[PDB]
Symmetry: C4
Subunit: 411 residues, 4 copies
């Protein structure tokens, strides 16, 4: 009878928490990436097309993160709407008006369907199986502060340790066994900076270590869990046209490197050729947020089709690209035509607790940027597409943004 009273009370508390969407069992995060052959399209929001008339936020960085019940598109907005004068982009990215918000995947980002997450001009978010963790960085450049919320309640803060634009992933953090992990950068974007990895439990930073990474540069990391460890594929904005990466276990014991493949993943970049396991200096300054998925010595690379502009997008399976420097690959899947605009891209995963699979499902999102600087508008925004890897038949195509620019507000 005591056993029954215990089970009843515990299950009742689980039911009461579940009424609010709060889980009861942490995501294990110990399964490996699923074997896949290609990418099946998951979502397209048509945000800018709809925003030509609907009330849609002007957004950037529409990254996706999933709980055990839903997948959401998180994004940063300047608190302005498309086709409104406040969309005039003479506000620089880091502003007091910028906020991290979220809406259901596939829906246009509107004030009528978007939940508020935090005040942020740089952000990260993930779900540990119980509640949502959100990290939002706001403040001055010389003393930015990341506010860390768990289930909407402020649980911690992280202040800049270099006083030079504290900034983080702009995609989902990675959660394993009830601890979530993220990467933050403080310092120059055109030179050596400082990079730290953080272990956070129930929204409280329980550990951090600074990477000893001379001549490396980490920004806007795409991190995913795999077999109980974390892999982050990032952006070298200093002097690398191949992508830097850092992996670590749950105790923040890490390894670092660069993707060796001659199929260079950053943008801008040189033409394909001999790759390097060190920073590739040629056209290596600047970059774009990106991702890659590691399968042994092979790598799935998501990259633009252009070597010079954020145009086009493609998935490339290079079965030796993680460790070897040749420019040969096996499979290419077209995602966006080179004649059309792309932009930031990131990874996200679907855990077994959501899918029912015995493996970690990889997925990715792509931001389709319209407006300034390449188009004659007063604004810059992005719509989103997203794909998940499957071990079944797929096809390549082009799913571009589709909006007709300039808008009414631009004339």
């Amino acid at each position: 009878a005591d056993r029954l009273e215990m089970i009843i009370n515990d299950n009742v508390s689980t039911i009461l928490a579940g009424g609010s969407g709060t889980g009861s069992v942490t995501l294990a995060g110990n399964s490996s990436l699923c074997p896949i052959s290609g990418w099946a399209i998951y979502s397209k929001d048509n945000g800018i097309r709809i925003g030509s008339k609907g009330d849609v936020f002007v957004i950037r960085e529409p990254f996706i993160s999933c709980s055990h019940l839903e997948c959401r598109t998180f994004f940063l907005t300047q608190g302005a709407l498309l086709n409104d004068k406040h969309s005039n982009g003479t506000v620089k990215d880091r502003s007091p008006y910028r906020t991290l918000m979220s809406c259901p995947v596939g829906e246009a980002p509107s004030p009528y369907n978007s939940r508020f997450e935090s005040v942020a001009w740089s952000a990260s978010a993930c779900h540990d199986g119980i509640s949502w963790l959100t990290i939002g960085i706001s403040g001055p450049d010389n003393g930015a502060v990341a506010v860390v919320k768990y289930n909407g309640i402020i649980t911690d803060t992280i202040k800049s340790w270099r006083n030079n634009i504290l900034r983080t992933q702009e995609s989902e953090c990675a959660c394993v066994n009830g601890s979530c992990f993220t990467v933050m950068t403080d310092g120059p974007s055109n030179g050596q900076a400082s990079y730290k990895i953080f272990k956070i439990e129930k929204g409280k930073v329980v550990k951090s270590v600074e990477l000893n990474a001379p001549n490396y540069h980490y920004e806007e990391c795409s991190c995913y869990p795999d077999a109980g460890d974390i892999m982050c594929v990032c952006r070298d904005n200093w002097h690398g046209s191949n992508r830097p990466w850092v992996s670590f276990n749950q105790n923040l014991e890490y390894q670092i490197g660069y993707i060796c493949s001659g199929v260079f993943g950053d943008n801008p970049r040189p033409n394909d050729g001999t790759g390097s396991c060190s920073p590739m200096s040629s056209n290596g300054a600047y970059g774009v947020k990106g991702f890659s998925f590691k399968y042994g010595n092979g790598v799935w690379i998501g990259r633009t089709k252009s070597t010079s502009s954020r145009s086009g997008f493609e998935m490339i399976w290079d079965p030796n690209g993680w460790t070897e420097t040749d420019s040969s690959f096996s499979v290419k899947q077209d995602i966006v035509e080179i004649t059309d605009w792309s932009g930031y891209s990131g990874s996200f995963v679907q855990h077994p607790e959501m899918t029912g699979l015995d493996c970690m499902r990889p997925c990715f999102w792509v931001e389709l940027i319209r407006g300034r600087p390449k188009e004659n508008t007063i604004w810059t925004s992005g719509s989103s597409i997203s794909f998940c890897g499957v071990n079944s038949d797929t096809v390549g195509w082009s799913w571009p943004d589709g909006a007709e620019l300039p808008f009414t507000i631009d004339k």
Copy 2:
């Protein structure tokens, strides 16, 4: 005590799943169609009237499917809104912007009330009593791919086997005993093509068979469950003004034919006369998505009132129309005046697990198309009406779209 612990745990898991709207018992699908005498109006969304000022999607194919808790209108949109320049219809139906989405029955389809389902220029959706199954076909004409989601998670893919526009129902699939069934077509729309029927469990294709149907043509099938089997009434776009049909059991053992009644159900069509159990060649090319309900040798036929254009709509009970070729019928119920536009129509059912009845309730939806090609606008959209069969008093009338064209965007 062990029995109590088992019941508690299982019912608690049912409660936790039900919190997300996820059922626990599959729909049986073994009851027969309810005896009815007429059709009681169920819904009207006034989509285009509202969209004259509100933010409403330009849509097509507003088909309805029901779970055990709700009925939803699924639809395909080009990601544009009424009275916006992106509604300009020089995008052909099969575009990378087209998406399958859903809203509550009776509501205007808006970005503020519509859930995203999939990227699709051809679609199907149903509910097995536990979760929603969605099928969305996107991609190039020579290699289209259907993404199959169960509870929002990609569970399978189906690639074109003829490289000639893989395409499916544009209405609800049919679920019996935990297996859902659909029909897909690959090949020409003006000649012999290939037709396959699929059995899908938890979003995974567990069986498929290709119909041996020489001189038949199947497109845009309206399928419903009845007594543990499936009946599909479809569209012969090749050379049939009567409608083709295919029925099958849960092992995909099938029968095929054409509705024999001289009350021809397709559009365009000849005037009523002697029917055929074979394809009726006269005015048989082209067509419109439609449905019919079989009661023994009799048939409830939903059809346009015009023989040449998608104008008007009417329900006709022909007590021998499934097998006999005479043009006589018993009952006609007016739905839309011939002076007003109609369009696609489809069937949907309400299962005993939703209604509390001991039989399968038949219902149908009708799409009221406005805009191009017959009206001087830049856009084409559709509103919806829906009726359910009852064994009580009914009446005929005309419930047309009601919008005043052209809109502001057209001048």
Copy 3:
């Protein structure tokens, strides 16, 4: 142990149904009306003011009905929005576009917050403690059909028995002990017609009786439960400036009469004077939907302040007004200034299962009509206010609509 298994299963089913908002215990409806002294304001939606820019339905008859969890404003819309050309009122009230929908009390009626209920140009709705009952009448004047839904599922139909505009309450029906009751009228509005009262259980009409009421006229009845019986105060559109009423028990055994007070409750009406327990012919043709609450021989009367137009609104407690013909009363509470527009008004109740009280709480809603015919617009709409009776301090004031006419669409 068998007792525990039974309790667990039954409570689990109650929990699963409650997840959808479906109750488990019927409203008793056997308590008497609460003793009150005045009316405390409950809601104001400012619908037309907000609709000057927001996307708000052009509506009529915004009646309120409450479940055990919420109170909703039901209304009829022509499927058009304020400040849109489709709001042009050359559509007569009875149209195929008119629909019964509902939104939360106090909110402006928008396509983004309104649930679809039924297709209807005349309507009624109530809640029996388990599910919502909706009655929506649509169709031609000579054969209108009321579709009766329970929990959103069509459960019955009622066809016109006189072929002369079947029409019903335009306010909430009354539910007692699991049976809900309504009144419908078929026949002329300027002469003797037919009046029927209906007893409906789980959406199925289980009984109906036709009133033997020579020289009486019933339209647009406001019905409420009291002590296990039903009282309806209605509108004599034929030849009565006092209001007709009909009361009945759960077996539809009824009594009829007219409110005897010289404080005449209809509009138009003569000046106050000697009342009648028979139809008051003077200025008795035409009318307005209204209500009254009976307390022994006294009556709470809600009426316009003008004797000729739908202007102003006031509550009047006449402690002998139900049976005596004098024009004297005790208390008057101002609701809307006579310089401002009013319109339809109706009663609604809050049951003990919702309030926690030991009595039936009376409340009422008032429709504030703007537009045609008295104002120079192309449209006619109404906003709503609502009050509930309390036995505590209250005050009179004027809470008018507040919109500035004409709107942009009118020029």
Copy 4:
């Protein structure tokens, strides 16, 4: 077995109530304020920027109150939208159109996301752990009535006892042990008035006491719970540039005073100098709603940066400011630049039942007012920011409103 049946029934009732968001255990309110070092930003809605095109209410007083599940922004609106002619502010604050409504924290206040709370031109709201208590004052100046709702149901009324504008907090009331407490004022705003404190249980006023406070003036009190008592920091609109305060226990046994610090907290105010524990007459007439948090003899003061206009905002920790009159302080945290508009501000708390902490978390909100009287518009509205105190690293900055005035409606 009887114990099991009791536990099952009680937990089932808790589950059924929790399905509607209704709690089962009252907030204790006996913990002390958390030790903090600074303020981490919690929210920013960008209301006016978004309302330049979106459908956003013109609002005032956007105060925040939290339950055990969510935090909401309550606000008063005139039932008009930004950039609509009805936003013309020749309606004085106290109007029959004004309503108290609420939306999720951080979201722009829209008719599509705002719940209706009450009709009110003065308001208060809080949550006792079970249900929401709302107090809305409407009516004429000489007989205003506060309607008191608990869980949306009218539970009490409070009529003006001085017939001179009954008015209350415009921020959250304070709840301890199932009793909630508020302060109301009746009488002049430029002279001695009457001030009452109210104890309310389940929406019923169970006690009230009138303060014997000669030469004091209380308006727009910000009240918070601390260690089982209530502290209110208010506004002296008569003759005080320092803020008045009143504290009391659950039996309404009270103490009164003024904040002694020479860091004057009201606006307008003199320059910092020698403070007073009595009303500071210099520049003491008029004022602004504000707050302060008491920590022993020290005080956290939120105030404007300007001494003359509602411009700028800053948090100041004065470790002896509650009792000592010196103008020295320890810490200042910038919130809004003095070059930018601020306005009303208030406190709100997050209880242990929401946070999981062992202490009472203090937070505050700030209203950023745009429009009349200082800007050349026809309207006046406010957006909101909010911060919570943390014992971790923070930073000062300026998070202003950000809208570009005048709007389209103003030309």
